[PDB]
């Protein structure tokens, strides 16, 4: 059966960008092959130069977004180079059985494996490392991502009508728990393991030191701000593998939102803010109507502006005065 | 076009009360004019006399609830008297563009401005101050409120049938982060700015010192308890601009609930408790069936009874023994 | 009227098990009688032998799950033996009036009472102790449970079709706040009251020391793991009376989920993870398709694997290679 199915290999791209794909499937079910390389590396996450030892899928935090269609077969080749120091594996929330594949993908440095699973349920799902005994440590070190399983006939609105996006971005939100000394300064380590004992103590406080989008404070700002134009329909996929988040587009809305990310359910309309539970991926669809800068944030504003969970959207186009206008510019009474 | 539209001016009232309005619009679209004055003032929030320097819209925490209809134009005159010390602005989650209006409403003390925006989406929304660089500080100082955009034909249930309320109350929940000394006592300041550095440090703990309804512990109790009668249909609007909350009416339910507050979506039925994400406004509809005192609380009972997120509902009428009855009063075995 | 109704007495069983009942009612409305005895007792909650003074309904944490049908009358005899030291009562989120019955069920040690209420709304609800002045203390000491009010014609899917479960389990999640000394060690007490002052201080931190399923770390693991077989339809009822939780079945899904637990609403489909707000009970329906061990967890993995919110499901049957297969077992590159 499967031997008879067509196979296509796809090359992943770095978040927030997404690899090429078709919204409406043009072919029948296929075996979609992906390759990911685990990479333990140092990452500086803030403007003060705070450095951590991140555990990543393909060298990025979050790991890349995989896109397939309902009933396609996902075949992943997972490689753990001998330059790494820890055992890793992968748990797909999209898969059925063996801890999402975690029990079948345990690879020590210098090992590799290939897992295949049927994408039976449509929606956006979280995937993350989950080694027995140190699950939270690997997950909060940046080892998680997301996979999107699109219905074979694309997305639809609450009334069964087609929803087509012009652009898609993947925002991975990550909570970090950096160990601190007596005065409150962050500690630095030489190797991932040298941080273990301290890492566990920091996690137990349940209080993150940093909460970031795309691996670092201000990563989606400045020259890296997300872009769009008035009239463009954008789909924003957002994931949080360990903690709740409440995305909000300052100046806009979520026209159609799947907060818990499962497409067989009708979307919620006109959302101002939505709750994505820790360990879930959600998606929001919006058509830009005004140009300018938009602040895409986790709406616990302390987490957004003090901890790092904030990004920018830069939109081009003509301003619509009917929707909004300054009748009297700020002036002296 | 707009010059041709009828205009009506409305005077806001102090929460939990709401200004006069029509549920079902009796006129076509209009320009609804509101005026709000920013007020930085000292507020004591608990029984021990803990005092803070609140930043308010119209002198209250929360700011007043504005009510308009879908497709009406909201025109707000925002005044920042020269008696204030900080720059302020306003971000309407209900508006489209320029950070909800935040980028067009920056007023220094002694300045005023007038913004107009089209209320294109129905539902209850949060509005809050958002000055670049000190957003969380202003928001957690009490500078937020809510606006309700009613469908032109009023509220409807899950089956498209009309829902009419007899009473409406606005409960604004506020998380405060009061700086403390070594022993755990709250610090007092002379001016808002003298608290800034300390305020930022307290917020980063992500742990509120107080979580209150209507600006203070016990503000909606005693002589200020919310009132209703058996048979009355009540709509309770609840907002939290920065933190998640889980409202619950002890002794009752949310017959029809819009947890994320957007009316184009069908309400959730028979809710015991619902989650309102930080940065969102929700609404719950309930018909009282029993007289007595009801405890309206944030159902994280520590936040409710230890931190202050609890209010009272006092309902008059006849007790229904079919619904509930004490068969054997507490007595010695 | 009620005098004329048939009456049946039911004997409760210890969680995670549930007492015998019919999904589809075979009789008309009845008076369902239950008896519960309050029990203050010492409980060790972790592997290090940490001991607490729990306040329980029927000697367990959580209290037992009660099952009745819509419009049945629940009659509870609540006994507080003279061996107990505190006053207790019961608040049913399923009931209407008098604080869910809390105002009518205040019993001092050596007292008992009998309350009756009409189960007018279908769904799973939380019930908990709520004595004026020490509500959070009693609730976070383990004094809460849940009651399920099934529609008279059983559960149905999003399309009105019948949903029948073969097995049902009740998972009660409990957040504990154990007082600690200067070094971080847990304090031990002789009597419940001797812990009061310290208990209040620990709760105010809003940071649990333990978050467990069925009263203890690892309570639903090993020989006590939940069991099922491939092909079996299982309903998992989950409750949290004070704090939000985000259940997730590692290796599976929630085919049909009522996150806020009210059956008059259509279920959410194909959920990977769902949010149950503090003070709520939810239910998830799943048909096992693969054998093996599944990790049922609160998906804030720190709370799950460091604090104790994790259990096991052990499923028997034949492995399905179409759904998942290891193409290349972990091997040296
Ligand atoms: Cu790993
Ligand atoms: Cu906002
Ligand atoms: Cu301000
Ligand atoms: Cu309650
Ligand atoms: Cu009690
Ligand atoms: Cu997981």
Short mmCIF file of N, CA and C in Angstrom, two decimals, chain C residues 45-165:
data_model
loop_
_atom_site.label_atom_id
_atom_site.label_comp_id
_atom_site.label_asym_id
_atom_site.label_seq_id
_atom_site.Cartn_x
_atom_site.Cartn_y
_atom_site.Cartn_z
N UNK C 45 2.05 13.08 50.57
CA UNK C 45 1.88 13.37 49.16
C UNK C 45 3.03 13.17 48.18
N UNK C 46 4.24 12.87 48.65
CA UNK C 46 5.35 12.66 47.73
C UNK C 46 6.29 11.55 48.19
N UNK C 47 7.28 11.22 47.36
CA UNK C 47 8.23 10.15 47.66
C UNK C 47 9.17 10.41 48.83
N UNK C 48 9.34 11.68 49.19
CA UNK C 48 10.22 12.03 50.30
C UNK C 48 9.47 11.92 51.61
N UNK C 49 8.19 11.60 51.53
CA UNK C 49 7.37 11.44 52.73
C UNK C 49 6.75 12.71 53.28
N UNK C 50 6.62 13.74 52.45
CA UNK C 50 6.02 15.00 52.88
C UNK C 50 4.60 14.71 53.33
N UNK C 51 4.29 15.11 54.56
CA UNK C 51 2.98 14.87 55.14
C UNK C 51 2.15 16.13 55.36
N UNK C 52 0.86 16.02 55.09
CA UNK C 52 -0.04 17.14 55.28
C UNK C 52 -1.29 16.69 56.03
N UNK C 53 -2.07 17.67 56.48
CA UNK C 53 -3.32 17.42 57.17
C UNK C 53 -4.40 17.76 56.16
N UNK C 54 -4.88 16.74 55.45
CA UNK C 54 -5.90 16.93 54.43
C UNK C 54 -7.31 16.98 55.01
N UNK C 55 -8.19 17.70 54.32
CA UNK C 55 -9.59 17.81 54.71
C UNK C 55 -10.30 17.15 53.54
N UNK C 56 -10.93 16.01 53.80
CA UNK C 56 -11.57 15.25 52.73
C UNK C 56 -13.06 14.93 52.86
N UNK C 57 -13.65 14.64 51.71
CA UNK C 57 -15.05 14.24 51.62
C UNK C 57 -14.90 12.73 51.42
N UNK C 58 -15.38 11.94 52.37
CA UNK C 58 -15.31 10.49 52.28
C UNK C 58 -13.91 9.86 52.33
N UNK C 59 -12.95 10.59 52.88
CA UNK C 59 -11.60 10.06 53.03
C UNK C 59 -10.68 10.04 51.84
N UNK C 60 -11.06 10.70 50.76
CA UNK C 60 -10.22 10.72 49.57
C UNK C 60 -10.02 12.12 49.01
N UNK C 61 -8.95 12.26 48.23
CA UNK C 61 -8.62 13.51 47.53
C UNK C 61 -8.40 13.04 46.08
N UNK C 62 -9.31 13.41 45.16
CA UNK C 62 -10.51 14.22 45.36
C UNK C 62 -11.64 13.45 46.04
N UNK C 63 -12.72 14.16 46.36
CA UNK C 63 -13.89 13.52 46.94
C UNK C 63 -14.48 12.66 45.82
N UNK C 64 -15.33 11.68 46.13
CA UNK C 64 -15.91 10.83 45.07
C UNK C 64 -16.80 11.53 44.04
N UNK C 65 -16.86 10.95 42.84
CA UNK C 65 -17.68 11.50 41.77
C UNK C 65 -19.11 10.98 41.92
N UNK C 66 -20.07 11.90 41.94
CA UNK C 66 -21.48 11.55 42.04
C UNK C 66 -22.06 11.61 40.63
N UNK C 67 -22.92 10.65 40.29
CA UNK C 67 -23.52 10.64 38.97
C UNK C 67 -25.04 10.55 39.06
N UNK C 68 -25.72 11.51 38.43
CA UNK C 68 -27.18 11.54 38.39
C UNK C 68 -27.60 11.99 36.99
N UNK C 69 -28.90 12.12 36.76
CA UNK C 69 -29.40 12.55 35.45
C UNK C 69 -30.13 13.87 35.59
N UNK C 70 -30.19 14.60 34.49
CA UNK C 70 -30.87 15.89 34.45
C UNK C 70 -32.28 15.79 35.02
N UNK C 71 -32.59 16.71 35.93
CA UNK C 71 -33.89 16.81 36.58
C UNK C 71 -34.16 15.80 37.68
N UNK C 72 -33.12 15.07 38.07
CA UNK C 72 -33.22 14.13 39.19
C UNK C 72 -33.05 15.07 40.38
N UNK C 73 -33.36 14.59 41.58
CA UNK C 73 -33.16 15.40 42.78
C UNK C 73 -32.02 14.75 43.55
N UNK C 74 -31.01 15.54 43.90
CA UNK C 74 -29.87 15.03 44.65
C UNK C 74 -30.12 15.28 46.13
N UNK C 75 -30.08 14.22 46.93
CA UNK C 75 -30.27 14.37 48.36
C UNK C 75 -29.03 13.86 49.05
N UNK C 76 -28.29 14.78 49.66
CA UNK C 76 -27.06 14.41 50.33
C UNK C 76 -27.11 14.52 51.84
N UNK C 77 -26.66 13.47 52.50
CA UNK C 77 -26.57 13.45 53.95
C UNK C 77 -25.09 13.70 54.21
N UNK C 78 -24.77 14.84 54.82
CA UNK C 78 -23.39 15.20 55.11
C UNK C 78 -23.12 15.06 56.60
N UNK C 79 -22.15 14.22 56.93
CA UNK C 79 -21.79 13.97 58.32
C UNK C 79 -20.39 14.46 58.68
N UNK C 80 -20.30 15.17 59.80
CA UNK C 80 -19.03 15.69 60.29
C UNK C 80 -18.81 15.07 61.67
N UNK C 81 -18.16 13.90 61.73
CA UNK C 81 -17.90 13.21 63.00
C UNK C 81 -17.22 14.10 64.04
N UNK C 82 -17.45 13.80 65.31
CA UNK C 82 -16.88 14.59 66.40
C UNK C 82 -15.37 14.40 66.54
N UNK C 83 -14.79 13.57 65.68
CA UNK C 83 -13.36 13.34 65.71
C UNK C 83 -12.65 14.42 64.89
N UNK C 84 -13.43 15.19 64.14
CA UNK C 84 -12.88 16.27 63.33
C UNK C 84 -12.76 17.51 64.21
N UNK C 85 -11.95 18.47 63.78
CA UNK C 85 -11.73 19.68 64.56
C UNK C 85 -12.30 20.96 63.96
N UNK C 86 -12.67 20.92 62.68
CA UNK C 86 -13.19 22.12 62.04
C UNK C 86 -14.61 22.04 61.51
N UNK C 87 -15.18 23.22 61.28
CA UNK C 87 -16.52 23.33 60.71
C UNK C 87 -16.33 23.15 59.21
N UNK C 88 -17.30 22.51 58.56
CA UNK C 88 -17.25 22.28 57.12
C UNK C 88 -18.64 22.46 56.53
N UNK C 89 -18.71 22.51 55.20
CA UNK C 89 -19.98 22.62 54.49
C UNK C 89 -19.73 22.16 53.06
N UNK C 90 -20.73 22.27 52.19
CA UNK C 90 -20.55 21.85 50.81
C UNK C 90 -21.26 22.78 49.84
N UNK C 91 -20.54 23.15 48.79
CA UNK C 91 -21.04 24.04 47.75
C UNK C 91 -21.02 23.26 46.44
N UNK C 92 -22.20 22.99 45.90
CA UNK C 92 -22.34 22.27 44.64
C UNK C 92 -22.46 23.28 43.51
N UNK C 93 -21.51 23.28 42.58
CA UNK C 93 -21.59 24.19 41.45
C UNK C 93 -22.78 23.79 40.58
N UNK C 94 -23.30 22.59 40.80
CA UNK C 94 -24.43 22.10 40.02
C UNK C 94 -25.78 22.62 40.52
N UNK C 95 -25.82 23.10 41.76
CA UNK C 95 -27.06 23.56 42.38
C UNK C 95 -27.34 25.05 42.24
N UNK C 96 -28.60 25.41 42.43
CA UNK C 96 -29.02 26.81 42.33
C UNK C 96 -29.51 27.34 43.68
N UNK C 97 -28.84 28.37 44.18
CA UNK C 97 -29.23 28.98 45.43
C UNK C 97 -28.34 28.70 46.62
N UNK C 98 -28.44 29.58 47.62
CA UNK C 98 -27.69 29.46 48.86
C UNK C 98 -26.22 29.05 48.73
N UNK C 99 -25.49 29.71 47.84
CA UNK C 99 -24.07 29.42 47.65
C UNK C 99 -23.84 27.95 47.28
N UNK C 100 -24.70 27.42 46.42
CA UNK C 100 -24.58 26.03 46.00
C UNK C 100 -24.94 25.07 47.11
N UNK C 101 -25.48 25.61 48.20
CA UNK C 101 -25.86 24.79 49.34
C UNK C 101 -24.95 25.05 50.53
N UNK C 102 -23.88 25.80 50.31
CA UNK C 102 -22.93 26.09 51.36
C UNK C 102 -23.53 26.77 52.58
N UNK C 103 -24.51 27.64 52.35
CA UNK C 103 -25.16 28.37 53.43
C UNK C 103 -26.13 27.50 54.23
N UNK C 104 -26.51 26.35 53.67
CA UNK C 104 -27.46 25.45 54.32
C UNK C 104 -26.82 24.19 54.90
N UNK C 105 -25.51 24.04 54.68
CA UNK C 105 -24.83 22.83 55.14
C UNK C 105 -23.67 23.00 56.12
N UNK C 106 -23.68 24.08 56.90
CA UNK C 106 -22.61 24.31 57.86
C UNK C 106 -22.74 23.35 59.04
N UNK C 107 -21.80 22.42 59.15
CA UNK C 107 -21.83 21.45 60.25
C UNK C 107 -20.55 21.44 61.07
N UNK C 108 -20.71 21.58 62.38
CA UNK C 108 -19.58 21.55 63.30
C UNK C 108 -19.31 20.09 63.62
N UNK C 109 -18.13 19.78 64.18
CA UNK C 109 -17.86 18.38 64.50
C UNK C 109 -18.98 17.85 65.40
N UNK C 110 -19.48 16.66 65.08
CA UNK C 110 -20.56 16.08 65.86
C UNK C 110 -21.92 16.39 65.29
N UNK C 111 -21.94 17.03 64.12
CA UNK C 111 -23.19 17.40 63.48
C UNK C 111 -23.34 16.76 62.11
N UNK C 112 -24.57 16.76 61.62
CA UNK C 112 -24.86 16.23 60.30
C UNK C 112 -26.04 17.01 59.75
N UNK C 113 -26.26 16.91 58.45
CA UNK C 113 -27.35 17.63 57.81
C UNK C 113 -27.71 16.92 56.51
N UNK C 114 -28.86 17.26 55.94
CA UNK C 114 -29.29 16.66 54.69
C UNK C 114 -29.82 17.75 53.78
N UNK C 115 -29.21 17.85 52.61
CA UNK C 115 -29.58 18.84 51.62
C UNK C 115 -30.14 18.17 50.38
N UNK C 116 -31.12 18.81 49.76
CA UNK C 116 -31.69 18.29 48.52
C UNK C 116 -31.74 19.43 47.51
N UNK C 117 -31.36 19.15 46.27
CA UNK C 117 -31.40 20.15 45.22
C UNK C 117 -31.72 19.49 43.88
N UNK C 118 -32.33 20.26 42.99
CA UNK C 118 -32.69 19.77 41.67
C UNK C 118 -31.55 19.98 40.68
N UNK C 119 -31.13 18.91 40.01
CA UNK C 119 -30.04 18.98 39.03
C UNK C 119 -30.63 19.45 37.70
N UNK C 120 -30.84 20.76 37.59
CA UNK C 120 -31.45 21.34 36.39
C UNK C 120 -30.57 21.52 35.16
N UNK C 121 -29.25 21.46 35.32
CA UNK C 121 -28.35 21.64 34.18
C UNK C 121 -27.40 20.47 33.98
N UNK C 122 -27.33 19.94 32.75
CA UNK C 122 -26.44 18.81 32.48
C UNK C 122 -24.97 19.21 32.32
N UNK C 123 -24.08 18.33 32.75
CA UNK C 123 -22.65 18.58 32.64
C UNK C 123 -21.92 18.06 33.86
N UNK C 124 -20.60 18.23 33.89
CA UNK C 124 -19.80 17.83 35.04
C UNK C 124 -19.53 19.13 35.80
N UNK C 125 -19.69 19.09 37.12
CA UNK C 125 -19.51 20.27 37.96
C UNK C 125 -18.60 20.00 39.15
N UNK C 126 -18.00 21.06 39.67
CA UNK C 126 -17.14 20.92 40.84
C UNK C 126 -18.01 21.13 42.09
N UNK C 127 -17.68 20.42 43.17
CA UNK C 127 -18.33 20.67 44.45
C UNK C 127 -17.15 20.86 45.40
N UNK C 128 -17.30 21.76 46.35
CA UNK C 128 -16.21 22.01 47.28
C UNK C 128 -16.69 22.64 48.58
N UNK C 129 -15.87 22.49 49.60
CA UNK C 129 -16.16 23.07 50.90
C UNK C 129 -15.96 24.58 50.75
N UNK C 130 -16.74 25.37 51.48
CA UNK C 130 -16.62 26.82 51.41
C UNK C 130 -17.09 27.50 52.69
N UNK C 131 -16.35 27.33 53.80
CA UNK C 131 -16.75 27.96 55.06
C UNK C 131 -16.30 29.41 55.09
N UNK C 132 -17.22 30.30 55.44
CA UNK C 132 -16.92 31.73 55.50
C UNK C 132 -15.61 32.02 56.24
N UNK C 133 -14.70 32.72 55.58
CA UNK C 133 -13.43 33.06 56.20
C UNK C 133 -12.24 32.17 55.91
N UNK C 134 -12.49 30.92 55.52
CA UNK C 134 -11.38 30.02 55.23
C UNK C 134 -11.66 29.13 54.04
N UNK C 135 -12.25 29.71 53.00
CA UNK C 135 -12.59 28.96 51.80
C UNK C 135 -11.35 28.38 51.10
N UNK C 136 -10.40 29.24 50.69
CA UNK C 136 -9.22 28.69 50.01
C UNK C 136 -8.44 27.65 50.83
N UNK C 137 -8.39 27.84 52.15
CA UNK C 137 -7.68 26.90 53.00
C UNK C 137 -8.29 25.50 52.93
N UNK C 138 -9.62 25.43 52.99
CA UNK C 138 -10.29 24.14 52.93
C UNK C 138 -10.20 23.54 51.54
N UNK C 139 -10.38 24.36 50.52
CA UNK C 139 -10.32 23.86 49.15
C UNK C 139 -8.93 23.34 48.79
N UNK C 140 -7.89 24.09 49.11
CA UNK C 140 -6.54 23.65 48.77
C UNK C 140 -5.98 22.61 49.74
N UNK C 141 -6.82 22.14 50.66
CA UNK C 141 -6.42 21.10 51.61
C UNK C 141 -7.00 19.77 51.10
N UNK C 142 -7.61 19.82 49.92
CA UNK C 142 -8.19 18.64 49.29
C UNK C 142 -9.70 18.48 49.39
N UNK C 143 -10.39 19.47 49.93
CA UNK C 143 -11.83 19.37 50.11
C UNK C 143 -12.68 19.80 48.92
N UNK C 144 -12.62 19.01 47.86
CA UNK C 144 -13.40 19.28 46.66
C UNK C 144 -13.54 17.98 45.87
N UNK C 145 -14.53 17.95 44.99
CA UNK C 145 -14.78 16.79 44.16
C UNK C 145 -15.57 17.23 42.95
N UNK C 146 -16.37 16.33 42.39
CA UNK C 146 -17.18 16.67 41.23
C UNK C 146 -18.44 15.82 41.15
N UNK C 147 -19.45 16.34 40.46
CA UNK C 147 -20.70 15.63 40.26
C UNK C 147 -21.02 15.71 38.78
N UNK C 148 -21.48 14.59 38.21
CA UNK C 148 -21.83 14.57 36.80
C UNK C 148 -23.35 14.45 36.63
N UNK C 149 -23.92 15.39 35.89
CA UNK C 149 -25.35 15.41 35.61
C UNK C 149 -25.48 15.07 34.12
N UNK C 150 -25.79 13.82 33.83
CA UNK C 150 -25.93 13.36 32.45
C UNK C 150 -27.28 13.70 31.85
N UNK C 151 -27.30 14.04 30.55
CA UNK C 151 -28.58 14.35 29.91
C UNK C 151 -29.38 13.05 30.04
N UNK C 152 -30.71 13.12 30.06
CA UNK C 152 -31.49 11.89 30.21
C UNK C 152 -31.33 10.90 29.05
N UNK C 153 -30.85 11.38 27.90
CA UNK C 153 -30.63 10.51 26.75
C UNK C 153 -29.14 10.29 26.44
N UNK C 154 -28.31 10.44 27.47
CA UNK C 154 -26.89 10.24 27.31
C UNK C 154 -26.15 11.32 26.54
N UNK C 155 -24.86 11.09 26.34
CA UNK C 155 -24.02 12.04 25.62
C UNK C 155 -24.23 11.94 24.12
N UNK C 156 -23.97 13.04 23.42
CA UNK C 156 -24.12 13.10 21.96
C UNK C 156 -22.96 13.89 21.38
N UNK C 157 -22.63 13.63 20.11
CA UNK C 157 -21.55 14.34 19.46
C UNK C 157 -22.04 15.66 18.86
N UNK C 158 -21.16 16.35 18.15
CA UNK C 158 -21.49 17.64 17.56
C UNK C 158 -22.67 17.62 16.59
N UNK C 159 -23.01 16.43 16.09
CA UNK C 159 -24.11 16.30 15.15
C UNK C 159 -25.37 15.67 15.74
N UNK C 160 -25.41 15.58 17.07
CA UNK C 160 -26.58 15.01 17.72
C UNK C 160 -26.60 13.50 17.76
N UNK C 161 -25.50 12.87 17.37
CA UNK C 161 -25.42 11.41 17.38
C UNK C 161 -24.95 10.91 18.75
N UNK C 162 -25.45 9.73 19.16
CA UNK C 162 -25.10 9.12 20.45
C UNK C 162 -23.64 8.78 20.67
N UNK C 163 -23.14 9.12 21.86
CA UNK C 163 -21.77 8.83 22.24
C UNK C 163 -21.87 7.95 23.48
N UNK C 164 -21.35 6.74 23.40
CA UNK C 164 -21.40 5.80 24.51
C UNK C 164 -20.00 5.39 24.94
N UNK C 165 -19.69 5.55 26.22
CA UNK C 165 -18.37 5.15 26.70
C UNK C 165 -18.43 3.77 27.34
#
